[PDB]
Each structure stands twice: as C-alpha cells, then as structure tokens.
Amino acid sequence: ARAQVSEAILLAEGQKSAVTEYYLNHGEWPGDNSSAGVATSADIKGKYVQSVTVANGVITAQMASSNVNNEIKSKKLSLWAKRQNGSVKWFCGQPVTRTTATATDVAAANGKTDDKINTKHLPSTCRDDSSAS
C-alpha cells in the first residue's frame, strides 16, 4: 500500500513546477489543469494512478481502481502549498480543497471518508492535516 502511495506522490510532485510557476507569475493559484498548462487530469497517469487534478493550486492524485491494493483503490491524496511570508511550503496528505484562487487556507475535501486514503497507508511524511501551516 505505502509503496504504491509513495509512487503516486512522486507522480503528483511532477506537477508542482506548473503550479508554483503560475503562482509566481499571477499571484494566485491556477483554477484547473488547463489554466495551469498541464494535461487533462485523466491523461496524467502512471503506475497505480488514474488521474491527477489541479484545482486552485491543489494537486490531487487518484489511485487506480485495479492492480492496486484493495484498501486504496480509487482513493485520493493531495499536495498543496501555503504562503508563509514570501516563501511557500508544500504539504502532503488526505484530500483538501481551496475554494478560491486567492484563498490562503484550504478545507478538508473528504468525500464522506470514501476518497480518503487511510492514514496507515500514507507515508509518514505525507500525513499533513488540512489545517497544517
């Protein structure tokens, strides 16, 4: 499980440059994959990953539905960044959502627990809470 999740995190990290550069150039986060200049979400695939979706700067990877551990089939994790006075810090954990392109904070984006990869299956360094800062 964790081995599969760690490869999903690495794939999702491949979209960070598009998101960070957009923030650098616009002072706000990209609304979707197209505005970030990246491929459509279902075309960002890999080992164990069916899609990667950019939404207001949050990068959410969705695990594949087959050929993955039963307990993480089709579940999701997010990478997201927050301003910390000039620099930005990237976080990794359960799914989050940023409601607007300019919001500083994020909210948890659970799916009524359905989309959440269980914490036992997240690498120890990818357990950031939605409230992390």
Side-chain angles (χ1 to χ4, degrees), residues 73-129:
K73 287 172 174 299
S74 308
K75 296 186 187 298
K76 292 171 194 180
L77 65 88
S78 289
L79 313 180
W80 72 100
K82 276 193 175 176
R83 196 196 313 110
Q84 49 175 12
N85 304 17
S87 57
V88 82
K89 189 157 189 283
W90 277 92
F91 301 94
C92 187
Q94 297 275 14
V96 304
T97 176
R98 180 175 274 119
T99 302
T100 72
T102 58
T104 59
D105 295 326
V106 300
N110 282 13
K112 310 181 207 300
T113 220
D114 188 37
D115 290 346
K116 301 177 81 171
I117 295 167
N118 177 25
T119 39
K120 282 191 173 182
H121 300 142
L122 294 170
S124 54
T125 58
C126 185
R127 295 183 190 193
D128 293 323
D129 190 79

